[PDB]
Amino acid sequence: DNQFYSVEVGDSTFTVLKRYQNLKPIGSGAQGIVCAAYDAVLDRNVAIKKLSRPFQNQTHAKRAYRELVLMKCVNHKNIISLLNVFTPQKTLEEFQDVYLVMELMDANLCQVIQMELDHERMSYLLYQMLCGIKHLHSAGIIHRDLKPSNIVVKSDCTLKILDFGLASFMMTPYVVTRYYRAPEVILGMGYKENVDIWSVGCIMGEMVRHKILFPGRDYIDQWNKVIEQLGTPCPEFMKKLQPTVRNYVENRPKYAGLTFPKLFPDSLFPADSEHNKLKASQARDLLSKMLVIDPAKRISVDDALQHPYINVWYDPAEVEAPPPQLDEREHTIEEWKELIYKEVMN
Ligand SMILES: CNC(=O)c1cc(-n2ncc3cc(Nc4c(F)cccc4Cl)c(COC)cc32)cs1
């Protein structure tokens, strides 16, 4: 009679529509436990994410509402698209949980990063990342927090970005991964579309080095890794800085910065055949153009898509697909609950 049923995965309770069977865990973290399942109605495997009272506080609520709203604005194969959204609760007063359903992928990009990838797969993953970012930008969405843990991949090299980036305080075991954020974000500068190119360069470089490029306890540590490796930025960059942050950055110890042959030596690249020698030099060239502190000097998304390392995959239908409510302010728990509930059941 009832449309739903409940099972215990890990230690969370999943109450899902009966069409979804054989729930197995695949991931946990920030704002959602996730299960794989078989969708008996679509005859395909899916991933199901549980949002446990997303309205419980501002940080959870703004992200839940935003990503439920934004996913109807984008339509692109390298960007999340939902198959279903539902709550097992019946009225607003009973509402607690939201369940999101998408295609089941094969792996997280963190997993792929730990592998040895030929140039064809690396360049195809990066090409798809840039296509998705370009689609987001065309829809007026600048991500600012692109990171591998929110990117998923299938065995055939196809890739999807799962989140929409930045707009806090969390009272939980949770901690935010900040290593892929641009200097604009680290330093509070304001930004344009190519803020996301930095994060792609951080992902790129980690595929080559198999180590996080700019680790650190906080932005303090992080900034130190940035300047130690790329060198202190030019005065032209300093002048963009708010006057207090400028003082801190200018008074940091001055480093000259390593060249990119030394940051990404030949050893890290496939370079036995002439084809692979050439691709290694094209890869390091692209790296040197997106790991650039000053956004005025950093390569754009469009130019990155024309780079010789990337454009071997080009095709008009992928990079330029037709683009498409609103982003809201501070609300109470009660108000967020109703906003999310109403978006859940359009
Ligand atoms: C055999 N397959 C595997 O081992 C793997 C499959 C995946 N995989 N595939 C899809 C997918 C979606 C989400 N998040 C999510 C969701 F489930 C539903 C709606 C929205 C969102 Cl953002 C997560 C959780 O990411 C932290 C992992 C996911 C990763 S490893």
* CATH number of the domain within which 34 lies: 3.30.200.20
User: Do residue 96 and residue 237 come from a single domain?
Assistant: no
Report the distance separating Cα 17 and Cα 28, nearest Å: 21
Report the distance separating Cα 313 and Cα 120, nearest Å: 9
User: Do residue 50 and residue 97 come from a single domain?
Assistant: yes
User: Do residue 118 and residue 233 come from a single domain?
Assistant: yes
Report the distance separating Cα 233 and Cα 225, nearest Å: 13
CA distances from 183 to 161, 198, 230, 333 (A): 22, 8, 12, 33
Domain assignment present for 314: yes
Domain assignment present for 337: no
Nearest CA to ligand 1 atom 12: 47
Domain assignment present for 76: yes
Instruction: Say if residue 280 carries a ligand binding annotation.
Output: no
Query: HSE (CB half, 13 Å, CA atoms) of 139?
Result: 24
Final residue in a domain of this structure, among 82, 106, 130: 106
Say what the resolution is, in angstroms: 2.0
Using the structure block, give the residue that is written with the tokens 């390569």.
299
* Nearest of 311, 1, 265 to residue 126 by alpha carbon: 311
Final residue in a domain of this structure, among 73, 106, 139: 106
List of residues 6+ apart from 336 with CB closer than 8 A: 54, 55, 58, 61, 62, 65
Torsion of CA 197, 198, 202, 208, to 10 degrees: 60
43 catalytic? Reply is: no
Distance 259 CA to ligand 1 centre (A): 38
Cα three-residue angle 46-177-61, rounded to 5 degrees: 65
Q: Which of 105, 155, 176 to mutate to test the pocket of ligand 1 (most atoms within 8 A of CB)?
A: 105
Domain assignment present for 216: yes
Using the structure block, give the residue that is written with the tokens 């930095």.
198
Burial of 155 (0-12, 13-18, 19+ CB in 10 A): exposed
Using the structure block, give the residue that is written with the tokens 């997303």.
54
> Which residues does a gap of C–N over 2.5 Å follow in the chain?
167, 324
User: Do residue 96 and residue 124 come from a single domain?
Assistant: no
- Contact indicator for 83, 39 with CB cutoff of 8 Å: yes
DSSP 200: H
Distance 206 CA to ligand 1 centre (A): 21
Report the distance separating Cα 182 and Cα 189, nearest Å: 10
Instruction: Say if residue 46 carries a ligand binding annotation.
Output: no
List of residues 6+ apart from 90 with CB closer than 8 A: none
Distance 34 CA to ligand 1 centre (A): 7
What lines the ligand 1 site, CB under 6 Å?
A: 26-27, 29, 34, 36, 47-49, 80, 100-102, 104-108, 152, 162
Final residue in a domain of this structure, among 72, 106, 140: 106
Sheet strands (E) in 40-175: 44-52, 84-86, 97-103, 107-108, 151-153, 159-161
Indicate which atom in ligand 1 lies nearest the CA of residue 100. 19
Domain assignment present for 328: no
Catalytic pick from 1, 11, 39, 145? 145
**Element (DSSP H or E) covering residue 224:** helix 219-230
User: Do residue 177 and residue 313 come from a single domain?
Assistant: yes
Sheet strands (E) in 40-125: 44-52, 84-86, 97-103, 107-108
Residue type, 192: K
User: Do residue 82 and residue 115 come from a single domain?
Assistant: no
User: Do residue 224 and residue 266 come from a single domain?
Assistant: yes
Using the structure block, give the residue that is written with the tokens 């009966």.
18
Domain assignment present for 212: yes
Nearest CA to ligand 1 atom 11: 47
Instruction: Say if residue 296 carries a ligand binding annotation.
Output: no
Report the distance separating Cα 219 and Cα 252, nearest Å: 13
How many folded domains does the chain comprise? 2
User: Do residue 152 and residue 214 come from a single domain?
Assistant: yes
Nearest CA to ligand 1 atom 9: 105
User: Do residue 47 and residue 121 come from a single domain?
Assistant: no
Indicate which atom in ligand 1 lies nearest the CA of residue 34. 17
Q: Which of 44, 52, 83, 152 to mutate to test the pocket of ligand 1 (most atoms within 8 A of CB)?
A: 152
User: Do residue 102 and residue 112 come from a single domain?
Assistant: no
Q: Which domain holds residue 41?
A: 4-106
Helices (H), 231-266: 235-238, 243-250, 260-263
Nearest CA to ligand 1 atom 16: 49
Report the distance separating Cα 95 and Cα 80, nearest Å: 25
DSSP 56: G
The coordinates were experimentally obtained by X-ray
Task: Return the percent helix, strand and coil in the chain, to nearest 5.
Answer: 40, 15, 45
User: Do residue 113 and residue 99 come from a single domain?
Assistant: no
Distance 167 CA to ligand 1 centre (A): 22
Residue type, 270: P
Domain assignment present for 342: no
Distance 48 CA to ligand 1 centre (A): 8
DSSP 268: G
User: Do residue 164 and residue 233 come from a single domain?
Assistant: yes
Checking phi first, is residue 126 left (phi over 0); if not, alpha (psi -120 to 50) or beta?
alpha
Domain assignment present for 242: yes
Domain containing residue 302: CATH number:
1.10.510.10
List of residues 6+ apart from 259 with CB closer than 8 A: none
